[PDB]
Design a protein around this ligand. Structure first.
Ligand SMILES: [Fe+2]
Ligand SMILES: [Fe+2]
Ligand SMILES: [Fe+2]
Lengths: 282, 282, 282
């Protein structure tokens, strides 16, 4: 097996091209870069610029006005243990009308791209979710933008259907994001022309095991890269609704160690009453 | 914003004084010291003394007789990874009649103070829990007394309604407990005359977002304080009943990333079948 | 109290011998070695040999063919953060017909031994699970074989009914597995003639508190044992069905900090929709 992280054009997949190769990617790797999906670098930079300005120059009062009273990183600003800004389809917290305009447009484009790629994952695998495709994809997305100051993130897999990641690079050129591919950790660099897609465990679940959910991590630099090692990432989790329903025996056939009585269950039955975005194997 | 941790007299709040200031504390900080609440330092020291004597001089058999067969720190003694002693309203494990007398009185005073302050949090925010105030406050408290030998605790927020903390100081004067206030970690020293209150996430939940649940941590000393760095803390979690019921849309409006189908849910639906006292943002 | 880890012969316990001593072990220690239970060292070595050969010499494609698409360590091979091989009663992933023959026989013998010892734990404590003994023991076992390359595992207790552990030793003689016994960590060495049994929290639960679930950990070597410090362990979790039902008040009497409304609950109500094999006190 080639252990290259492939690139697919969303437009081409939508036209029914590369289906064998897309299926094989999904099963053997569960990650790919995605071009031609409406996500430009120029827009990335307009949303990045305005949030970095807020992180840098927003006063404590401005920051407090867009901070939830529980520090869950669901909505608004989180001073972290890094700085984060989160949003979804509603209940958002925005610093200014300008920020709101730029981030609503950016979110919507990320949501559209994620739905579209998930629709292709389902089609390529012959999967019709219980309740139909479009109700499955009208869901509970979460977008988190994180600034990291000059492992940085422990290995895990995502529990999303898909996760779309747009990064900014380290000024020093260090590549921080890595995933398991072919039994080896492989670099996932920034590309101005593409978004990185990770498949998550709900893809594996809904397709009956036809999609891998790869583990990944964020590495820290060694000696030379203290200097020039800040980076940012825009992480869009496409997450199912609480009432997404699946087959319990089918889940057990593809590695889910469920403790569910009966023949069908929901996402809420499986994960509980709070969303869990990631899981460690360890 | 002043980033001072304020002090309120429970008696004054009960008389309807300082309401604007109490509301603003609750929303912007979610922590305060509480005087005039029936918790003396002299009593703290009588309960502390008898449990420290047990920790120090109790034999393994004495300790085993008050150790639960699962090491959950719910009741009785836990030799930890520190030493802890836990209690609640019933099912307690006591080393001797004297200890029982002193710790039952101490627990009861902590429970009374916690209920009283929670009642003021609810009143100041205009909150009537589903099922009424008094059923909400007749709940599932947990008291944990921890001795720490000469970060010591990772940052988290509490999932209680409120948490009351009485500490003993480091002989060397180091201040170990810190909380986020105004975007900076701030010292929370021992005060002989007051108990520290942290608001927890259930306060945020039940009030519809009018109360912050602050993050906090316990720091370790640097070079000078190896010597004189032991301390103790009495941590009283006021925790809701499993059947405490709340609005799902309201929860989503104030930062809770719930995965709950339908319009109302219980605490058990949200957190699951075992109590979870704390949560990390990370 | 003697703080020796005792040995019992399963055959003798089955004949009704040593009952007082077995009860006292279960309550005060919750761990023992088990002889005369159908688990030989020769068989251990035949299963170990064939899986170590696979770990060493299996190609990435061979490994991929027996890797689940979600990395849960439920079934098949997991390249870890060490290498693991997992199996249960069905849905297994086997590298070759020979491996399948040897590992099916090995699993079955481990399952038989675990059921048998659990049956004695129940009998010695006078326990009839809701729904009867044999339905309780026809359950959801998980076997995990781990190779460790030259703490290595944080302290926890198991959430199984019982856990059977067969190890291979460090070539250098270092003893890595340790458990709390009598308030001190005690060595649990490899024995060619016996399997180690840990009681888990479901034993404590189903018996109404008559069985301790001990904490344990895996230590790393110091200076001399870098060399000769690889080891393996075969860990068999005997885990209840999702619908195992118990008394909520009884659970609270023996240390379980449950958040369960009502008088009875299931294992799924308590732990949720995914199996959780271990728990930290910390
Ligand atoms: Fe991730
Ligand atoms: Fe806390
Ligand atoms: Fe264990």
């Amino acid at each position: 097996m080639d252990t290259t992280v492939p690139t697919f054009s969303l437009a081409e997949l939508q036209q029914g091209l590369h289906q064998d190769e897309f299926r094989r990617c999904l099963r053997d790797k569960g990650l790919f870069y995605l071009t031609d999906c409406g996500l430009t670098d120029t827009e990335l930079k307009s949303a990045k610029d305005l949030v970095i300005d807020f992180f840098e120059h927003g006063s404590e009062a401005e920051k407090r006005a867009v901070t939830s009273p529980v520090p869950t990183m669901r909505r608004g600003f989180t001073g972290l243990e890094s700085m984060c800004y989160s949003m979804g389809t509603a209940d958002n917290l925005f610093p200014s009308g300008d920020f709101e305009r730029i981030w609503t447009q950016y979110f919507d484009r990320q949501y559209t791209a994620s739905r579209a790629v998930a629709r292709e994952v389902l089609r390529a695998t012959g999967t019709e979710p219980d309740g139909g495709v479009e109700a499955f994809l009208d869901c509970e997305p979460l977008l988190r933008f994180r600034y990291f100051p000059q492992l940085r993130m422990a290995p895990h897999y995502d529990l999303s259907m898909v996760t779309l990641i747009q990064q900014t690079p380290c000024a020093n050129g260090f590549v921080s994001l890595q995933a398991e591919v072919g039994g080896a950790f492989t670099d996932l660099p920034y590309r101005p022309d593409a978004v990185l897609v990770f498949c998550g465990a709900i893809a594996t679940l809904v397709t009956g095991g036809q999609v891998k959910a790869p583990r990944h991590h964020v590495a820290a630099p060694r000696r030379d890269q203290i200097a020039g090692s800040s980076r940012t990432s825009s992480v869009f989790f496409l997450r199912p609704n609480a009432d997404f329903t699946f087959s319990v025996p089918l889940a057990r056939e593809c590695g889910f160690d469920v403790s569910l009585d009966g023949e069908t269950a929901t996402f809420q039955d499986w994960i509980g009453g709070n969303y869990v975005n990631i899981r460690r194997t360890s």
